[PDB]
Design an enzyme around this catalytic site. Structure first.
Site, PDB file in Angstrom:
ATOM      1  N   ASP A  36      49.553   5.687 -18.121  1.00 34.01           N
ATOM      2  CA  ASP A  36      50.957   5.341 -18.144  1.00 34.01           C
ATOM      3  C   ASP A  36      51.142   4.691 -19.512  1.00 34.01           C
ATOM      4  O   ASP A  36      50.910   3.496 -19.689  1.00 34.01           O
ATOM      5  CB  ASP A  36      51.278   4.373 -16.994  1.00 34.01           C
ATOM      6  CG  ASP A  36      52.730   3.864 -17.031  1.00 34.01           C
ATOM      7  OD1 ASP A  36      53.547   4.358 -17.836  1.00 34.01           O
ATOM      8  OD2 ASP A  36      53.042   2.952 -16.247  1.00 34.01           O
ATOM      9  N   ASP A  75      49.333   6.343 -11.493  1.00 32.70           N
ATOM     10  CA  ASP A  75      49.113   7.292 -12.576  1.00 32.70           C
ATOM     11  C   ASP A  75      47.777   7.219 -13.304  1.00 32.70           C
ATOM     12  O   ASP A  75      47.080   6.207 -13.261  1.00 32.70           O
ATOM     13  CB  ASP A  75      50.242   7.136 -13.599  1.00 32.70           C
ATOM     14  CG  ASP A  75      51.634   7.135 -12.959  1.00 32.70           C
ATOM     15  OD1 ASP A  75      51.811   7.627 -11.821  1.00 32.70           O
ATOM     16  OD2 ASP A  75      52.565   6.629 -13.610  1.00 32.70           O
ATOM     17  N   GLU A 105      46.815   0.948  -8.955  1.00 36.90           N
ATOM     18  CA  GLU A 105      48.005   1.348  -9.667  1.00 36.90           C
ATOM     19  C   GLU A 105      47.584   2.454 -10.633  1.00 36.90           C
ATOM     20  O   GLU A 105      47.264   3.546 -10.170  1.00 36.90           O
ATOM     21  CB  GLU A 105      48.650   0.170 -10.386  1.00 36.90           C
ATOM     22  CG  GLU A 105      50.080   0.435 -10.793  1.00 36.90           C
ATOM     23  CD  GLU A 105      50.778  -0.826 -11.277  1.00 36.90           C
ATOM     24  OE1 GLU A 105      50.860  -1.816 -10.486  1.00 36.90           O
ATOM     25  OE2 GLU A 105      51.234  -0.816 -12.443  1.00 36.90           O
TER      26      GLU A 105
END
Length: 542
Positions: free
Chosen positions: A283, A280, A247
């Site tokens: 984040d 990302d 993630e």
């Protein structure tokens, strides 16, 4: 001798002498050596009796699920811990041998293998990232949840140093003043690798990720839930490196989790690097009506006073966004983002200042509408754009100091200005002319409205050039112009109205405008006298 020995030797118990970890914990006084591999069952809980212990790990804790450490005294240290799952799951590896990202669901499904590293277990976030993969993944590769997790629960002042592992996770639940220091590259499991979760009790404070690195994992490398470092900014991520997070590299949670807020305030995010995250780099948003947090009536969506201290961050290779955040009244500085597939920066900020930002070759796969987006009324001071590959859409922001080979038609801002430059020199290389162009974006975003040029007369080394001042007419750039020294003639070439000039063509008093009178082969001059009255005179004749 016993009396003497009791006073001259360092106390330490070792796991090899006990059947269970709790038995060793109970015998411990000062040190505790993990000298043999220990298989734990999920949920196995150890009570350290409030003792301040120094746990030295020289072996592994093996198991799927959580090994829970509770009641460690303030000042306790755990060094060298290695977590490893018993299960070897199915993992995907969305990148090639040349390190190119794979974006095709079928190509990603083809990478499936059983391994505890060099890839990660697919999760629902992947269904979004690689559209169609949900239906292509074989059932045994779906919904896996393997993580060997060391959970430190409700402790204060405990530090974990040089931790590592395979399919490993580290969870600080309800802790304060705890640190994850010099993580020795653990390879992540299904859950976030390093998590500071404070959904219950007081807001987390004093929790840090200091130095070290992590690799892989299906979720985020370092993440915080309901932490507030206070004005002192006591908490955050400093000097950390995240590689290939399933993630994001660093994530502050957004929205409601359970019946409370998972948001974070007053943390530091500095001197860190995030490379190749599937989503990302950083984040740092808080919003996605706020139970346990500020009401929407007090602070509108994306306008919370997060107040993080953000500085000196580098991001490279994100398949998603390099740097993302929201908030109001933020000061952000020295951010460098390079080679990202989605936006380099996605900023849902208002009344914030961004200083010395470099967004180099991002949105390379056109995942987003721009390389950098800013929603609110912000200030950007120093923006470097374009490497070797809209560029910026910040409708309400004022910008100064852009450098780079940007295409001007791809810039959209509220105001762009260089108010404090000194005397200027435009140096032209490889061309027969030098130029200073003017473009009024309201008139046209693609065509320059006027220019000041200098052009070579003859060839190089002629010692002669002519200067020309131009204006656009009929959407044709440089359609009309005045020249000085064309062909080294040393005179000014002046444009005149091709037909009878209308009274309204002349603007100022004490000025004249030459015009052509074809019927007499004469040049006339519409003159606005010093008193404002118009008179038409004969200027040149046969």
């Amino acid at each position: 001798y016993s009396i003497e020995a009791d006073k001259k030797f360092k106390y330490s118990v070792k796991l090899s002498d006990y059947p269970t970890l709790q038995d060793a914990a109970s015998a411990a006084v000062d040190g505790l050596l993990i000298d043999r591999d220990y298989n734990f069952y999920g949920g196995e809980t150890v009570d350290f009796g409030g003792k301040v212990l120094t746990i030295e790990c020289k072996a592994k804790f093996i198991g799927d699920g959580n090994l829970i450490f509770t009641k460690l005294g303030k000042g306790s240290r755990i060094a060298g811990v290695f977590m490893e799952s018993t299960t070897t799951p199915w993992v995907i590896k969305p990148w090639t041998d040349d390190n190119q990202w794979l974006t095709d669901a079928a190509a990603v499904v083809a990478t499936l293998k059983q391994s505890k590293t060099d890839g990660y277990q697919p999760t629902v976030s992947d269904y979004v990232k690689f559209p169609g993969i949900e239906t292509l993944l074989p059932p045994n590769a779906k919904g896996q949840n393997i993580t060997s997790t060391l959970e430190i629960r409700e402790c204060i002042g405990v530090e974990v140093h040089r931790a590592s592992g395979l399919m490993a996770g580290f969870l600080f639940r309800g802790c304060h003043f705890c640190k994850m220091v010099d993580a020795n590259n653990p390879s992540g499991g299904k859950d976030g690798i390093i998590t500071f979760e404070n959904l219950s009790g007081d807001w987390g404070k004093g929790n840090y990720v200091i130095g070290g690195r992590t690799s892989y994992g299906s979720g985020s490398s370092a993440q915080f839930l309901r932490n507030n470092g206070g004005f002192e900014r006591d908490g955050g991520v400093i000097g950390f490196t995240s590689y290939r997070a399933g993630e994001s590299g660093v994530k502050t949670w957004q929205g409601t989790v359970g019946s409370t807020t998972s948001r974070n305030y007053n943390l530091q995010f500095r001197d860190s690097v995030v490379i190749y995250p599937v989503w990302d780099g950083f984040d740092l948003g808080a919003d996605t009506d706020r139970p346990g947090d500020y009401p929407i009536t007090q602070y509108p969506l994306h306008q919370l006073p997060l107040n993080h201290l953000i500085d000196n961050l580098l991001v490279r290779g994100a398949l998603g966004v390099g740097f993302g955040m929201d908030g109001k009244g933020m000061y952000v500085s020295n951010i460098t983002v390079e080679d990202c597939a989605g936006s380099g920066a996605y900023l849902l900020t208002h009344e914030s200042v961004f200083t010395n930002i470099a967004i180099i070759d991002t949105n390379t796969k056109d995942f987003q509408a721009n390389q950098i987006y800013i929603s609110g009324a912000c200030r950007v001071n120093g923006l470097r754009l374009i490497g070797i590959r809209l560029t910026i859409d910040a409708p309400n922001s004022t910008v100064s100091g852009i450098t780079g080979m940007v295409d001007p038609s791809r810039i959209n801002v509220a105001n762009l200005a260089e108010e404090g430059l000194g005397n200027i020199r435009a140096n032209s290389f490889g061309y027969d002319s030098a130029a200073i162009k003017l473009r009024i974006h309201k008139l046209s975003k693609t065509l320059d409205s006027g220019a000041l040029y200098s052009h070579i007369n003859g060839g190089a080394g002629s010692g002669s050039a002519y200067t020309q001042l131009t204006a656009i007419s009929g959407s044709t750039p440089d359609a009309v112009s005045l020249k000085v020294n064309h062909k080294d003639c040393r005179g000014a070439e002046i444009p005149f109205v091709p037909d009878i000039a209308s009274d309204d063509f002349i603007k100022d008093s004490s000025c004249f405008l030459p015009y052509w009178e074809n019927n007499s082969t004469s040049l006339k001059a519409l003159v606005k006298k010093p008193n404002g009255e118009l008179v038409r005179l004969t200027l040149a004749t046969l």
